[PDB]
Amino acid sequence: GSQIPASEQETLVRPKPLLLKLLKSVGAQKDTYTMKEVLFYLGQYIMTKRLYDEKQQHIVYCSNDLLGDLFGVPSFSVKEHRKIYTMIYRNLVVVN
Numbered sequence: 549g550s551q552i553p554a555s556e557q558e559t560l561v562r563p564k565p566l567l568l569k570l571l572k573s574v575g576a577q578k579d580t581y582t583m584k585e586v587l588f589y590l591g592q593y594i595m596t597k598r599l600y601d602e603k604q605q606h607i608v609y610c611s612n613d614l615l616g617d618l619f620g621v622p623s624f625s626v627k628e629h630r631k632i633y634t635m636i637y638r639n640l641v642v643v644n
């Protein structure tokens with residue numbers, strides 16, 4: 549988190565189909581998103597589908613959800629920031 553630049557939030561991205569499917573269940577459908585948007589929408593999606601909770605030792609549990617299929621893990625810590633960006637980057641392309 550400390551070594552992640554604030555400029556990351558401005559990266560412009562095109563979600564691959566499965567990630568786009570998830571995003572469209574929580575936000576406006578667009579072709580190009582910022583990473584700020586993707587993180588916000590994923591966070592709301594997680595909360596909405598109860599994949600994360602108080603006192604779960606900061607773990608998101610996604611094995612019963614399409615998110616698990618996108619990310620290819622059954623669970624992950626919200627504290628593992630660089631791993632989160634890697635799992636996200638597998639499901640989008642950067643637009644420049």
Ligand SMILES: CCO[C@@H](c1nc2cc(-c3noc(=O)[nH]3)nc(-c3cncc(Cl)c3)c2n1[C@H](C)[C@H]1CC[C@H](C)CC1)C1CC1
Pocket residue numbers: 549587588590591592594595600606608626627628629630632633
């Ligand atoms: C309103 C809902 O909030 C979500 C949330 N909780 C967090 C706690 C900490 C955190 N980091 O260190 C600690 O000790 N805690 N970090 C992030 C975080 C923020 N931005 C980028 C990155 Cl990579 C991580 C947190 N998020 C993000 C919005 C959320 C973004 C989507 C990502 C796939 C999973 C995390 C909950 C999961 C549903």
Ligand SMILES: [Cl-]
Pocket residue numbers: 612613614615
């Ligand atoms: Cl699902």
